[PDB]
Design an enzyme around this catalytic site. Structure first.
Site, short mmCIF file in Angstrom:
data_model
loop_
_atom_site.label_atom_id
_atom_site.label_comp_id
_atom_site.label_asym_id
_atom_site.label_seq_id
_atom_site.Cartn_x
_atom_site.Cartn_y
_atom_site.Cartn_z
N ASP A 25 -11.12 -41.85 53.19
CA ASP A 25 -9.73 -41.77 53.42
C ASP A 25 -8.89 -42.50 52.40
OD1 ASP A 25 -7.37 -41.79 54.92
OD2 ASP A 25 -8.45 -42.47 56.70
N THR A 26 -8.29 -41.74 51.49
CA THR A 26 -7.41 -42.26 50.44
C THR A 26 -6.10 -42.76 50.97
OG1 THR A 26 -6.45 -40.13 50.28
CG2 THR A 26 -8.35 -40.59 48.87
N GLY A 27 -5.72 -42.31 52.15
CA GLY A 27 -4.49 -42.73 52.80
C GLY A 27 -4.62 -44.06 53.56
#
Ligand SMILES: N#CN=C1N(Cc2ccc(CO)cc2)[C@H](Cc2ccccc2)[C@H](O)[C@@H](O)[C@@H](Cc2ccccc2)N1Cc1ccc(CO)cc1
Lengths: 99, 99
Positions: A25-27
């Site tokens: 998850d880059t967020g």
């Protein structure tokens, strides 16, 4: 591994002698794991979500093996519906977003 | 472009003749935008989350311009602390995660 996004990017992780599957998850700024048993040593905290706030425990200096790579850091352990590997670890794993 | 993860992967989006900033999020199946003036009709919906639930308005076939790329898809409008670009769109702008 180049990971296309047609399917959720799931990876196998090993933590505190346990095998899990987690989301890249880059967020996410931090990594957050579903309730698990850890030796420690932990501080509390509430975080931001969608929607809502979840109280999590803060374990620092946790060795995590992600897809083969060893990485150390802080992981929160809370009532998450999914295991999430946030940017804190992604940066150690030398991960990148390409488009 | 290539993005490292030391900092939030924030991009500029044009949507409905409005300029905004959004978070590329490999962990989000769907795209969820904060509340804004969107024309056309929409269906009610509820997305799951961490310690909560946000009821949003589903809109489809909405033109979104991410970076220079154009995409068309389902955009969820609602109460979110952040504008999120999910895999449904990420897939269209051809993003890949690499590690
Ligand atoms: N909710 C939540 N929670 C979420 N969502 C929204 C989200 C969730 C689901 C959809 C579609 O179903 C769309 C968006 C997903 C988590 C997730 C994914 C799938 C299923 C459940 C949970 C995203 O994958 C995740 O990146 C972020 C998105 C977010 C970031 C910043 C502010 C607000 C939100 N997040 C909270 C979060 C913040 C910080 C840390 C660490 O610092 C961990 C997790």
């Amino acid at each position: 591994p180049q990971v296309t996004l047609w399917q959720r990017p799931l990876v196998t992780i090993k933590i505190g002698g346990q095998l899990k599957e987690a989301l890249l998850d880059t967020g996410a700024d931090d990594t957050v794991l579903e309730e698990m048993s850890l030796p420690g040593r932990w501080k509390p905290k509430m975080i931001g979500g969608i929607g809502g706030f979840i109280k999590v425990r803060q374990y620092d200096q946790i060795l995590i093996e992600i897809c083969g790579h060893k990485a150390i850091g802080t992981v929160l352990v809370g009532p998450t519906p999914v295991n999430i590997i946030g940017r804190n670890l992604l940066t150690q794993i030398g991960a990148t977003l390409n488009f």
